[PDB]
Design an enzyme around this catalytic site. Structure first.
Site, PDB file in Angstrom:
ATOM      1  N   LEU A  74       9.353   5.856   1.701  1.00 58.06           N
ATOM      2  CA  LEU A  74       7.918   5.184   1.518  1.00 58.06           C
ATOM      3  C   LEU A  74       6.825   6.172   2.065  1.00 58.06           C
ATOM      4  O   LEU A  74       6.738   6.826   3.029  1.00 58.06           O
ATOM      5  CB  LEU A  74       7.934   3.828   2.469  1.00 58.06           C
ATOM      6  N   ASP A  75       5.645   6.304   1.256  1.00 57.54           N
ATOM      7  CA  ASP A  75       4.628   7.079   1.308  1.00 57.54           C
ATOM      8  C   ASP A  75       3.537   6.520   2.082  1.00 57.54           C
ATOM      9  O   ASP A  75       3.752   5.217   2.317  1.00 57.54           O
ATOM     10  CB  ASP A  75       3.893   7.591  -0.102  1.00 57.54           C
ATOM     11  N   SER A  76       2.537   7.203   2.561  1.00 59.91           N
ATOM     12  CA  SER A  76       1.580   6.893   3.286  1.00 59.91           C
ATOM     13  C   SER A  76       0.541   5.778   2.579  1.00 59.91           C
ATOM     14  O   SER A  76      -0.213   4.594   3.203  1.00 59.91           O
ATOM     15  CB  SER A  76       0.570   8.217   3.976  1.00 59.91           C
TER      16      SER A  76
END
Lengths: 169, 85, 55, 55, 58, 118, 457, 72, 166
Positions: free
Chosen positions: B39-41
């Protein structure tokens, strides 16, 4: 009764010829409610009136007449002016409810006719305009608070204005 | 209708499974989305917005940083909306 | 999301449906009117009320 | 004669739950049902004088 | 103006009482009086417009 | 009052001065909250808490009047023109209505015959 | 008939045992208040004199009944206060109410101006002792000294005014004798004679100028909240303006013209301040200015219609504002602050008192005909006959009369009070019984307002 | 089933019952007050003969209870 | 923090997008276009360029800022049930219930009496634990968690306990 003018007699009669259907729904319900809760109410009212038997008539209305004019005795006296001012205050309270009767005479015309309004009656319209205009000049209106000592000044001011106009013409 | 403790955990898992970008086999419920799951920011805020639409729509901006794991997010949503007696 | 019809809802909307359709028959015919306005302009005045709803 | 009598009935029917609002008789859970039954017969008692007015 | 035919319109409602919606013969009389009166009112405005055009020429 | 653009997030920088500015504000905020926290979570209390902020807020309007208004200069004098001034403004409004009314009673009647009350 | 049984209440509290006291003072006052509605109501066309001029009859004053209504009502809420202190301190400040009621009965009944004057100023002395002592907050002296140096500054000019009338024109005495009074010739020497008669009833009846006497007395609470109602009794206690303007100077109205306008601006500006004010007692203190200002406007017009509303407003305000102060007192003995924002929460904490909060606030508005609508409506109708421009200003006042009482409601109708933990018991029987004894007389005046509004009605 | 919201209720509901108990206590002569119009004569309007202007009550109208209060 | 300001802007961007679009399929389409705009500048990290981007992010967004957005059902501020159907009653007015009425439902009173005795006894231990935390001023931002596990209750006891329920 007696004092109230009102209309002479109302017609109010139904023919009922066009469309049989169910005779009349308004007439059938009127005959039904006359026996259900109208005749029963009439029976209880008659039973209470009969149970009274002994009734006291009593004096009801008091006399009290004249007792000398207020615009005759003056020069500031407690023994004389007190009873004279009492007569004026009695008449002022009577004149308040005289207007109310004439007011309700016009109310009776508006209720009975409705659609006619101003085209008919005319007598009650004329009776209202004659009394109220005279009431404005003689009793209070422009004479501030109710006082019989100031009431003689209001009559004198009207008498001086009428005499000034009569002298010119 | 009332919500159950087992029901709220199942409802959050059903929305997480249909994420497409995240693998259904790799992560279940106990695994954190911050380090373990991919999961990205920007993806973390987008996942929270989809979860709020399914359940009772209540999500604070200040409390968004505190919730990252799906197990912790299911507990925080149940506590704020008052679930399971 | 749970959406279901209740017995209280059925015996209320259906009773309003009769009132929302038969209002133009009972109220208009029973009450006696005064002065009829509809006479002139078949397209400019009479049809314009219905044409505005269509357009 | 009944026109004047039945006109007050419609007004008095609506004030009867206000008369029972100040304790009077106990009504648990049936108090919302009591208002429904009060207006129901208030409608019937209002329909009769309107039928007289058409006549 | 309509009073000659308007008396029959009130007679239908007074006689029927229930089923007041079923009245067409008396209702047509109120439509007939208004159709002639508005046409006469339109003819008076048309005659005034015709007289104004004739006076402008002279 | 509002400008051309509404302030909500506009004109903000990180820098170094603003970083220490937030540290100052949160320090007092936590200081005044902890004294509330120790007074809130105990069953032995029972009673409405005072707090020095709200007492001084009520004292700001009810009191602190005569220690103030010592430099009047011109701003206080302009308030008197908006103070007793409107009374002088309405003084010529009602007076013109009196000259209109009193003349009509004596000559050319305007009061209706139906009038009798007051 | 009224004096002597009222004086016998003085030895009652002192002779009775230490455990009782409050039971005897409340019960015996209620039976005497019954006889006021039994004997005083009888009148003819012009109300005939009672006896000798020690205490006389009522012509246009059923306002005595209101004083008899508050005769036990002031003793009810003063139970929670004074209870901690000594028995002698209790016995003194119950008898100071009885002494107040003794002088208050004497003011309304006695048809005089000379002896009326030494009863009008005589009511100031017992209230001075009550206001200066038992003050919960400070600045008691900034209200106690203000209570005399406003009233006595305006009322002492009556000694040079009233005696000047009787030395030239017979005697003042009965007022029923006063037909000797001749209209004023309008001279510069007679200018200050009219002003001296007015200024006494321009302070107690609050204008916009010299109005500061009133809010200082209300904010700095005398005892709890029931002694504040005695200050309400002094607003209506200045009823001599109904008697002086009608009799002593009937021709004089040219000098009334600026004083109507001074009270007219004491309606918009007095309502503006009563919106951002923090103190709950102050919000009733400034609302009491506007309601009594309506009477001031009505009296100076001198039309027979205005007095009908003026006399009604005296009774209307005396039972509604006093009702509002009891609601302020019911929060003052639970939260221990006059702050509006701090004490916030009805229905959730105060279930049945919230309905009393409604009926008291709705009476400031124009409700279905109780007494407040009846009292106000005649004044608005009288002002239009006076000058047509009035309702443009009077209508704006009607907007903020909503804001007078709805702002009181909104800042109490909120489910909060997070800082507050006290006020467990909402009403201990008598707390709601006070509220019922204030509203139910107004509900009984819906059927018969002829008894209330009666200057030759 | 739930514990629900909490109100004093006991102090509130008792006040209404204590109020009604004293309304009904003096509501008995109100019930007798209706029957006084029923049993005893209410009002009569007639021209009186010159003998006495006032007896017990000077002027009695509508209700008989007006004359009973006029004596005391 | 710079990272939190981007997160707050992105959270507002999606929730304000639903006001303009009608259908859910168009909402999913326009969300992909927004992600492409952010990802181009997300890779590059600068103290000057990224801060200028955040200040310019308010622009264009402010041009279409008020179409009356969907403010959710049970949500702080906005419209439609913010405090409505959630009035309830606080725990402060629980002990106010007098006898005779307090006798009804004895299980609710007995369990509350046992819980109140636990809260009163632990209040003295929590007061020493609250001042045990190192700050030497008063407090810093948030409340400190308890280290002891044997006694339990981390300072505040009536914070999480006693709350409103619909």
């Amino acid at each position: 009764x007696x004092x109230x003018x009102x209309x002479x007699x109302x017609x109010x009669x139904x023919x009922x010829x066009x469309x049989x259907x169910x005779x009349x729904x308004x007439x059938x319900x009127x005959x039904x409610x006359x026996x259900x809760x109208x005749x029963x109410x009439x029976x209880x009212x008659x039973x209470x009136x009969x149970x009274x038997x002994x009734x006291x008539x009593x004096x009801x209305x008091x006399x009290x007449x004249x007792x000398x004019x207020x615009x005759x005795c003056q020069e500031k006296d407690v023994l004389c002016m007190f009873e004279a001012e009492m007569q004026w205050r009695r008449d002022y309270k009577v004149d308040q409810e005289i207007v109310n009767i004439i007011q309700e005479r016009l109310k009776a015309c508006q209720q009975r006719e409705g659609e006619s309004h101003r085209q008919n009656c005319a007598k009650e319209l004329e009776q209202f305009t004659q009394v109220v205009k005279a009431y404005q000049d003689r009793y209070x209106x422009x004479x501030x608070x109710x006082x019989x000592x100031x009431x003689x000044x209001x009559x004198x001011x009207x008498x001086x204005x009428x005499x000034x106009x009569x002298x010119x013409x | 209708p009332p919500l159950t403790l087992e029901g709220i955990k199942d409802r959050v898992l059903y929305v997480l499974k249909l994420y497409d970008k995240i693998d259904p086999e790799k992560l279940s419920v106990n695994s954190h989305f911050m380090k373990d799951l991919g999961l990205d920011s920007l993806d973390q805020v987008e996942i929270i917005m989809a979860m709020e639409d399914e359940f009772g729509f209540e999500i604070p901006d200040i409390d968004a940083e505190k919730l990252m794991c799906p197990q912790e997010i299911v507990d925080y949503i149940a506590d704020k909306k008052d679930v399971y007696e | 999301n749970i959406n279901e019809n209740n017995p209280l809802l059925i015996n209320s909307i259906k009773r309003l449906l009769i009132g929302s359709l038969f209002a133009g028959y009972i109220i208009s015919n029973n009450i006696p009117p005064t002065t009829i306005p509809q006479m002139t302009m078949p397209y400019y005045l009479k049809t314009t009320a219905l044409i505005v709803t269509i357009l | 004669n009944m026109f004047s009598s039945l006109s007050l009935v419609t007004l008095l029917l609506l004030t009867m739950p206000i008369m029972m609002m100040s304790f009077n008789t106990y009504k648990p859970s049936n108090y919302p049902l009591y208002v429904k039954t009060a207006i129901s017969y208030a409608f019937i008692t209002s329909m009769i004088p309107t039928m007289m007015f058409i006549h | 103006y309509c009073a000659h035919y308007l008396i029959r319109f009130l007679k239908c409602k007074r006689d029927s009482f229930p089923n007041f919606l079923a009245c067409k013969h008396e209702r047509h009389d109120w439509d007939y009086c208004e159709h002639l009166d508005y046409v006469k009112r339109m003819k008076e405005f048309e005659r005034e417009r015709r007289l104004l055009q004739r006076k402008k020429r002279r | 009052x509002x400008x051309x653009x509404x302030x909500x997030x506009x004109x903000x920088x990180x820098x170094x001065x603003x970083x220490x500015x937030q540290a100052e504000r949160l320090a007092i905020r936590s200081r005044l909250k902890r004294e509330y926290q120790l007074q809130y979570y105990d069953p032995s209390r029972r009673g409405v808490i005072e707090d020095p902020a709200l007492v001084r807020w009520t004292y700001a309007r009810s009191a602190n009047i005569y220690p103030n208004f010592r430099p009047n200069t011109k701003t206080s004098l302009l308030g008197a023109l908006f103070g007793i001034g409107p009374l002088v403004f309405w003084y010529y409004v009602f007076k013109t209505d009196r000259d209109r009314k009193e003349k009509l009673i004596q000559e050319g009647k305007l009061d209706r015959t139906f009038n009798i009350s007051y | 008939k009224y004096i002597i049984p009222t004086i016998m209440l003085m030895p009652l509290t002192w002779l009775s045992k230490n455990n009782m006291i409050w039971v005897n003072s409340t019960a015996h006052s209620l039976l005497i208040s019954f006889t006021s509605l039994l004997l005083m109501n009888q009148f003819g066309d012009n109300s005939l004199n009672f006896s000798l001029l020690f205490f006389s009859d009522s012509l246009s004053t059923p306002l005595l009944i209101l004083t008899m209504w508050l005769l036990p009502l002031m003793l009810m809420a003063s139970q929670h206060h004074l209870s901690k202190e000594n028995l002698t301190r209790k016995k003194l400040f119950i008898t100071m109410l009885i002494s107040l009621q003794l002088f208050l009965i004497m003011t309304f009944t006695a048809m005089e101006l000379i002896l009326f004057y030494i009863l009008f100023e005589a009511t100031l002395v017992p209230t001075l002792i009550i206001i200066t002592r038992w003050g919960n907050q400070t600045e008691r002296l900034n209200a106690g000294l203000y209570f005399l140096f406003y009233t006595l500054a305006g009322s002492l000019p009556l000694l040079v005014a009233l005696i000047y009338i009787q030395n030239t024109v017979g005697s003042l005495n009965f007022l029923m004798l006063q037909y000797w009074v001749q209209p004023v010739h309008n001279s510069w020497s007679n200018v200050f004679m009219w002003l001296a008669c007015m200024m006494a009833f321009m302070v107690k009846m609050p204008l916009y100028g010299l109005h500061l006497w009133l809010p200082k007395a209300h904010v700095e609470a005398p005892i709890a909240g029931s002694m504040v109602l005695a200050a309400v009794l002094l607003k209506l206690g200045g009823y001599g303006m109904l008697r002086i303007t009608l009799i002593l100077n009937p021709m004089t109205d040219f000098m009334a013209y600026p004083f109507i306008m001074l009270s007219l601006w004491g309606m918009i500006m007095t309502s503006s301040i009563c919106l951002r004010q923090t103190d709950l007692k102050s919000l009733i203190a400034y609302s009491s200015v506007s309601h009594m200002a309506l009477v001031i406007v009505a009296i100076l017009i001198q039309t027979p219609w205005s007095y009908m509303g003026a006399t009604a407003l005296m009774i209307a305000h005396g039972l509604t504002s006093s009702m509002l102060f009891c609601l302020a007192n019911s929060n003052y003995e639970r939260i221990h602050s006059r702050t509006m924002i701090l004490a916030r929460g009805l229905q959730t904490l105060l279930p049945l008192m919230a309905t009393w909060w409604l009926l008291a606030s709705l009476t400031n508005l124009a409700l279905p005909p109780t007494i407040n609508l009846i009292g106000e409506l005649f004044v608005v109708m009288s002002t239009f006959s006076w000058s047509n421009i009035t309702i443009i200003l009077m209508g704006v006042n009607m907007v903020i009369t909503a804001l007078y009482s709805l702002y009181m409601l909104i800042m109490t109708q909120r489910g909060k009070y997070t800082y507050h933990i006290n006020n467990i018991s909402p009403s201990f029987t008598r707390e709601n019984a006070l509220m019922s004894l204030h509203i139910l007389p107004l509900l009984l005046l819906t059927l018969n307002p002829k008894i209330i509004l009666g200057p030759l009605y | 089933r739930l514990f629900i919201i909490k109100p004093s209720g006991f102090y509130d509901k008792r006040f209404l019952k204590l109020l009604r108990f004293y309304i009904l206590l003096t509501g008995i002569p109100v019930a007798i007050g209706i029957t006084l119009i029923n049993v005893x004569x209410x009002x009569x309007x007639x021209x009186x003969x010159x003998x006495x202007x006032x007896x017990x009550x000077x002027x009695x109208x509508x209700x008989x209870x007006x004359x009973x209060x006029x004596x005391x | 923090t710079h990272q939190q300001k981007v997160l707050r802007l992105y959270k507002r961007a999606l929730r304000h997008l639903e006001s303009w679009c009608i259908h859910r399929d168009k909402y999913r389409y326009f969300a992909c276009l927004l992600r492409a705009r952010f990802d181009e500048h997300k890779n590059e990290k600068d103290m000057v360029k990224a801060t200028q981007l955040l200040r310019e992010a308010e622009e264009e967004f402010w041009h279409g800022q008020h179409p009356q957005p969907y403010i959710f059902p049970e949500s702080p501020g906005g419209t439609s049930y913010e405090r409505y159907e959630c009035y309830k009653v606080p725990e402060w007015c629980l002990d106010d219930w007098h006898p005779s009425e307090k006798a009804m439902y004895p299980d609710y009173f007995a369990k509350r009496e046992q819980w109140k005795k636990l809260r009163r006894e632990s209040w003295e231990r929590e007061v020493x634990x609250x001042x045990x935390x190192x700050x030497x001023x008063x407090x810093x931002x948030x409340x400190x968690x308890x280290x002891x596990x044997x006694x339990x209750x981390x300072x505040x006891x009536x914070x999480x306990x006693x709350x409103x329920x619909x």
